[PDB]
Amino acid sequence: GAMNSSNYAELFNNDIKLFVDDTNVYRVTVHKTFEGNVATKAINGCIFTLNPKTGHLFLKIIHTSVWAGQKRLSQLAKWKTAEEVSALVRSLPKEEQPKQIIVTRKAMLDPLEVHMLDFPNIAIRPTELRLPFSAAMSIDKLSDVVMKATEPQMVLFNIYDDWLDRISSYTAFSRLTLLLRALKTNEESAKMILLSDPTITIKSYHLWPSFTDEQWITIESQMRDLILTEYGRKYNV
Amino acid sequence: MNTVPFTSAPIEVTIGIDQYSFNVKENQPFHGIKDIPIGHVHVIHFQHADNSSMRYGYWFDCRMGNFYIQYDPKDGLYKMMEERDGAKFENIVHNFKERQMMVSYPKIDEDDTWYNLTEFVQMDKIRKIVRKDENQFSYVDSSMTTVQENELSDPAHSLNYTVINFKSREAIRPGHEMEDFLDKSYYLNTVMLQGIFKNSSNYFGELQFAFLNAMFFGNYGSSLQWHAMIELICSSATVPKHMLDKLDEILYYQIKTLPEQYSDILLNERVWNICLYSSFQKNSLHNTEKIMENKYPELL
């Protein structure tokens, strides 16, 4: 069934499950042609496939070459997502394959279901949650590796850095989505908050700064305040 | 012309024969239906005055035997039975006509409606869907489930319609996932027509049988089957031109015969808007589109 605020805690049980977000698979800039018509230019994208319990992230870089000579690309992006997600499952030992795949957008249900026909016992599920995974390309290291790619490529990350050494997956995922929500709503301010202090660096094998526990509290409070300020502004409340 | 006699009418019942129907009263002198055209399948069906649930009935072909109706008070329903003694049977039929206690299959000579609803329905294919090989006729009622429905419980009483599933290995060639799901042409033409049905007339016959079951019994699973088989064609980019033209005729007469007040449960909004307006075949059902728009514009 669909995933919502009721069954939120199911993410963190010991049933393996992956989130799939396709929002950044097909990315274009829009520009004008010499004759004054509008045209798109595609840039590299990514499939964002995430295990919310372990933080492991299967970032599949989608090279602009895949669009070459293709029509109805926004439709095709969904089918390529499903194809790449299926191959990732197939590439994983059985005991690591997920029991559920939750797509962040309901339009991915049919493409994935059709591609997963070989895995009838993997349940493909929608969500009603409003997850901010589209903001992944606001994570500097993630955007960097996507934009530099010359070819299709799979890059692995732990999107929680080493947080789980000290906090639960429930807490780690609430931090991750808070940070991404903030980045989504006001990237410049979100990024300002994360980097203002030059003496808290990002480890080479990490995505976020090495905040201590107390400093994460302050940061989380600052991100909270940012999101509410921006909400007032949007709705003049 | 053929005859189906009734032993008696013990209980009040609305009797249908094909698209026609009559009210018969408890122990009214009623002894059957005469002048039934030979050359087509036929369906005699019932709805008791005391139970508007369960419509039931028997599909048959007069060329396959002498058939008659007899009420069973243990089971409480009108049963169809075959008389093997041709002499005895002409004898009963003749006496009841002499006494004029039979209704006449009331065909207008201009009207091809029943032909058009059953053109491709063969009694032999019916008997594979309703498996009960001790009888030459086939029982169907409102509550019977299909095989596909039994997969999602007594198989003896199942409607064995051909199973169609758009999200299945059968429908989707590995490697052509996107192509085969958006363009069901390979599933229709290779898997279903060439593979399973062998030709379009068997496909069509099952499509028409499905509809009539939905229509005369409110059989829900038959309604499902009918829409699936329409959907499979409309969602195929490559259909024999003779099939599209015959489909438009078939659907036209189905829509035309449907009771107006049943359009809500018997027509699936999604399938129809897809066939008529979205699918590859949006421009290929001109007669069906026109009757749907002038008779059920709300549904669209």
From Swiss-Prot, chain A:
Q: What is the effect of changing D21N?
A: Reduced growth at 30 degrees Celsius. Strongly reduced growth at 16 degrees Celsius
Q: Transmembrane segments in this chain: where?
A: none
Using the UniProt annotation, give all residue ranges assigned to the region (RNase H homology domain).
7-237
Q: Which domain of life is it from?
A: Eukaryota
Q: What is the effect of changing D21A?
A: Alters protein folding. Severely impaired growth. Strongly reduced growth at 35 degrees Celsius
Where does it live in the cell?
A: Nucleus
| Result when mutating D22A | Reduced growth at 30 degrees Celsius. Strongly reduced growth at 16 degrees Celsius. Strongly reduced growth at 35 degrees Celsius
The free-text function statement in the UniProt record for this protein reads: Functions as a scaffold that mediates the ordered assembly of spliceosomal proteins and snRNAs. Required for association of BRR2 with the spliceosomal U5 snRNP, and the subsequent assembly of the U4/U6-U5 tri-snRNP complex. Functions as a scaffold that positions spliceosomal U2, U5 and U6 snRNAs at splice sites on pre-mRNA substrates, so that splicing can occur. Interacts with both the 5' and the 3' splice site, as well as the branch region. Has a role in branch site-3' splice site selection. Associates with the branch site-3' splice 3'-exon region. Also has a role in cell cycle.
Domain description from the entry? The MPN (JAB/Mov34) domain has structural similarity with deubiquitinating enzymes, but lacks the residues that would bind the catalytic metal ion.
Further notes on this entry? Present with 468 molecules/cell in log phase SD medium.
**Complexes and interactors:** Component of the U4/U6-U5 tri-snRNP complex composed of the U4, U6 and U5 snRNAs and at least PRP3, PRP4, PRP6, PRP8, PRP18, PRP31, PRP38, SNU13, SNU23, SNU66, SNU114, SPP381, SMB1, SMD1, SMD2, SMD3, SMX2, SMX3, LSM2, LSM3, LSM4, LSM5, LSM6, LSM7, LSM8, BRR2 and DIB1.
Protein name as it appears in the record? Pre-mRNA-splicing factor 8
Q: What is the lineage of its organism?
A: Eukaryota, Fungi, Dikarya, Ascomycota, Saccharomycotina
Q: Which gene encodes it?
A: PRP8
Whole sequence portion shown: 1836 to 2069 of 2413
Swiss-Prot record, chain B:
Region ranges (Leucine-zipper): 244-265
Effect listed in the UniProt record for changing S236A: No effect on interaction with PRP8
Q: Which UniProt keywords apply?
A: Cytoplasm, mRNA processing, mRNA splicing, Nucleus, Phosphoprotein
Which CDD domains does the UniProt entry name for this protein? Aar2_C, Aar2_N
Q: Which residues carry this modification: Phosphothreonine?
A: T257
Provide a GO biological process annotation. Answer: spliceosomal snRNP assembly
| Recorded GO CC terms | cytoplasm; U5 snRNP
Q: Does the keyword Lipid metabolism apply?
A: no
| Further remark | Present with 7330 molecules/cell in log phase SD medium.
What's its job? Component of the U5 snRNP complex that is required for spliceosome assembly and for pre-mRNA splicing. Involved in splicing pre-mRNA of the A1 cistron and other genes that are important for cell growth.
How it assembles, according to the record, is: Heterodimer. Interacts with PRP8 (via RNase H homology domain and MPN domain), competing with BRR2 for the same binding site. Component of a U5 snRNP complex that contains at least the U5 snRNA, PRP8, SNU114, AAR2, SMB1, SMD1, SMD2, SMD3, SME1, SMX2 and SMX3, but is not a component of the U4/U6-U5 tri-snRNP complex.
Q: Which family does it belong to?
A: Belongs to the AAR2 family.
Name of the protein this chain belongs to? A1 cistron-splicing factor AAR2
Q: Which organism is it from?
A: Saccharomyces cerevisiae (strain ATCC 204508 / S288c) (Baker's yeast)
Gene symbol of the encoding locus: AAR2
